[PDB]
Every structure is written in structure tokens, then in C-alpha cells.
């Protein structure tokens, strides 16, 4: 309806659903296959809109597809197309065999090399660089919203909270202090969130701020407290977290700078060899 500006209408005869692999906000998530016009067949994720949906649910469902379809980048989840002319309504995206990054890393605690983790993080930063170039603030950047494929390539997903930079419930643990305080959302608030993702990745999917009260996460961060170095975290990476978490948003790096920093670490792996008693669990500064 509005989604066809940025989404191909797919012929449902080209979609084969293999298995229900999950449950989304708007209906089930399945995996399956898509036959392309060239007769190449690819694996896909298939999201369906629940039977008996409301007009609101349809608009929200397809609206997220409308945003995703605006981006064509190797580190942003690819929209293959939608099915709207038949029901159930569907959103078809590239298949990511290893699922959400946080859940994946929790299964593999301490099992990857620092260079592998840095590769993941560089891909995330590269996708965010493009999203921010396109004028979007994600507002939900978190490891649970990064998907990871069979070759460990990481891709930004979940555009439900995303919006264009122009004149309800928030992911408090991932949100910048200024965005919590007065809804000041900017690409620099996404850079804050990226710092949290960096901590999640280096922590193999530990929950940011563990189970601290939301009120205490807000107060502590505002007072200058920061999540502590993950075990065996390269100094360069902890410093990057701290830079992403600067109180003054103008002092945070841009996504382009983050990509550049990570690229230098990948190119000089010896850099990563320098590795990180306090009066509290969070570290002041």
C-alpha cells in the first residue's frame, strides 16, 4: 500500500515455508526458500502476519518492512520482498543461520578469537554507518537486534523503533543519557548504543547492567558510572566503549571513525594483545 515504494511484491508460488522457527510481535517467524526471477533458489526468513490482524498491526508490520527496504548494504538485513495481495501477509528477508547475536554468543562463551569478535563488531559498525548516512536513527541498537549468518557476518535488524531524523517504551539499558532524559535521539545516541553492543559482544552476551533496577541504571550512568571491562578485554576495545559512552554526545566518535578504528585493529592484531580492585561493580568514568 505504502510499502511498495521500497518492497518488491513477491509471487507466493515462489515461496516455500520449511519450518516455524519462532514467534514475532505480529505472527510467527518461519524459515524457507525463495525462487528468484532468475530461477536461483535462496534460503529466507519468512515473517507472517497473524490471522485476524488489526489494521494497526498490518501497518506496523509492513511499516518496518518499508524502512528495511530503503537500505541495501551487506551489514543491514536484506528485504527480499513482501506478499500483500494474498493472505497471510508476509515479509521475506535473508536467512541468518546463527540467529540473534546475543543468544549465539551465550552458547559460545570464550570460544571465539578476539579478531573474530572484532570482525563481528566491524560489520555492525559498517551497517550503522550506512543507516546514519541515510538519516535514520535506529533507537534499538542491541545485540538481540543483530543477526549473524553461517559465516559470522553480523547485520543490523529490527527497525520497529527506527525513524527519520526530522523536526513508547524505551530500551533503557541501551539508550543514551540524553535520550532517556529528554528524548534527544541522534546518530550520537545510536553510537552510545553501539558502545553497549560492543560490551555485550566482548562479554559474550551478558546482560548490560545485569538485573539492576531501571531507575538505578539511569541514575548510575547519569552520575558517570560505566559498565566495567569484560574479562580479558583488549584495552583498545574498552577505550572504544568509554568513548562511545562520553557524557557529551559531541565527543563520541562517528560511525565512520568507529569503522576506521576497528579496521586498524584488524590490520594490527598485535594491538589487541594489551589487555585490561574497585569500590563498586560499575566503574566511575
Amino acid at each position: 500500500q505504502t510499502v511498495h515504494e521500497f518492497a518488491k511484491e513477491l509471487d507466493a508460488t515462489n515461496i516455500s515455508i520449511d519450518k516455524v522457527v519462532g514467534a514475532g510481535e505480529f505472527g510467527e517467524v518461519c524459515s524457507g526458500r525463495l525462487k528468484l526471477p532468475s530461477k536461483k533458489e535462496i534460503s529466507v526468513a519468512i515473517k507472517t502476519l497473524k490471522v485476524g490482524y488489526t489494521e494497526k498491526q498490518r501497518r506496523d508490520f509492513l511499516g518496518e518492512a518499508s524502512i528495511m527496504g530503503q537500505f541495501d548494504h551487506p551489514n543491514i538485513i536484506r528485504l527480499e520482498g513482501v506478499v500483500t495481495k494474498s493472505k497471510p501477509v508476509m515479509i521475506v528477508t535473508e536467512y541468518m543461520e546463527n540467529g540473534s547475536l546475543d543468544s549465539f554468543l551465550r552458547k559460545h562463551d570464550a570460544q571465539f578469537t578476539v579478531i573474530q569478535l572484532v570482525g563481528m563488531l566491524r560489520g555492525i559498525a559498517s551497517g550503522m554507518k550506512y543507516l546514519s548516512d541515510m538519516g535514520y536513527v535506529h533507537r534499538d541498537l542491541a545485540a538481540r537486534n543483530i543477526l549473524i549468518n553461517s559465516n559470522l557476518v553480523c547485520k543490523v535488524s529490527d527497525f520497529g523503533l527506527s525513524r527519520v531524523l526530522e523536526d513508547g517504551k524505551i530500551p533503557i539499558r541501551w539508550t543514551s543519557p540524553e535520550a532517556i532524559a529528554y528524548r534527544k535521539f541522534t546518530s550520537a545516541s545510536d553510537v552510545w548504543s553501539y558502545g553497549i553492543v560492543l560490551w555485550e559482544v566482548m562479554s559474550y552476551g551478558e546482560r548490560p547492567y545485569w538485573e539492576m533496577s531501571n531507575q538505578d541504571v539511569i541514575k548510575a550512568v547519569d552520575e558517570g558510572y560505566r559498565l566495567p571491562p569484560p574479562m580479558d578485554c583488549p584495552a583498545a576495545l574498552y577505550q572504544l566503549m568509554l568513548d562511545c559512552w562520553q557524557k557529551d554526545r559531541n565527543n563520541r566518535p562517528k560511525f565512520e571513525q568507529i569503522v576506521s578504528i576497528l579496521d586498524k585493529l584488524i590490520r594490527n592484531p598485535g594491538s589487541l594483545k594489551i589487555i585490561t580492585a574497585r569500590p563498586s561493580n560499575l566503574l566511575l568514568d
Binding site: 538481540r144 513508547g168 524505551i170 530500551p171 533503557i172 541501551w174
Partner: peptide, 8 residues
């Protein structure tokens, strides 16, 4: 999830 909340 307890990941998303209002401020009270």
C-alpha cells in the same frame, strides 16, 4: 520483556 520500559 524487561528490556523495554517507561520511566516511572
Amino acid at each position: 520483556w524487561d528490556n523495554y520500559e517507561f520511566i516511572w
